[PDB]
Amino acid sequence: GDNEKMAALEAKICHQIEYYFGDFNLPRDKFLKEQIKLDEGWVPLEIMIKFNRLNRLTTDFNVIVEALSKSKAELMEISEDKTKIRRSPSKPLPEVTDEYKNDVKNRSVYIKGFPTDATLDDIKEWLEDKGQVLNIQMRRTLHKAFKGSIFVVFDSIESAKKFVETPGQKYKETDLLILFKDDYF
RNA sequence: UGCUGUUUU
């Protein structure tokens, strides 16, 4: 059903854009920050479609606008003429205080045992039924080769604990080592 | 402290 397929695509679009403008990417994204200074947070759709994971989903402005209009996250706003988008001023970036960093750390997790040829797509699929994940960091060498270990940030301490305490976890044939970031060094 | 990079650009 084409409506059915269009709805699945639009959900993916929302999630991707919401990641780029999110707490775990925006503060470290020089290119996106450049664009956000120029008019009250607004960024043109002609620039957004240059972002590679978004480009692969769609380059149609009409489809992007429809997607964001139906989002349940309430993060993104659309301009009057429908050519530009922004993070809402109701949702500011967190102040990076001791209390914030402690809270994030307590729900961050280290996982080791993925093959070196695994993709971000592969890791996301594996994580699908494991709880709400807000960030995936693939760990790399100096020369950018994947080490086979990751850091992940969960939505809550409750979700992180449920994941860490589950006993027999594997990726395909191989046993994983799973630790709170606090326990890794 | 700080500064610098950082492609899910």
From Swiss-Prot:
| Taxonomic superkingdom | Eukaryota
List, for all copies, the residue spans of the domain called HTH La-type RNA-binding: 3-95
User: What's the subunit arrangement here?
Assistant: Interacts with DDX15. May interact with RUFY1.
Q: What is the lineage of its organism?
A: Eukaryota, Metazoa, Chordata, Craniata, Vertebrata
* Native species: Homo sapiens
Compartment(s) of residence:
Nucleus
Purpose: Binds to the 3' poly(U) terminus of nascent RNA polymerase III transcripts, protecting them from exonuclease digestion and facilitating their folding and maturation. In case of Coxsackievirus B3 infection, binds to the viral internal ribosome entry site (IRES) and stimulates the IRES-mediated translation.
Q: What does the further note read?
A: Sera from patients with systemic lupus erythematosus (SLE) often contain antibodies that react with the normal cellular La protein as if this antigen was foreign.
First and last residue shown, out of the full length, are 5 to 189 of 408
- Write down which residues bear the modification named Phosphothreonine: 116
Instruction: Please identify the protein, giving its name as recorded.
Output: Lupus La protein
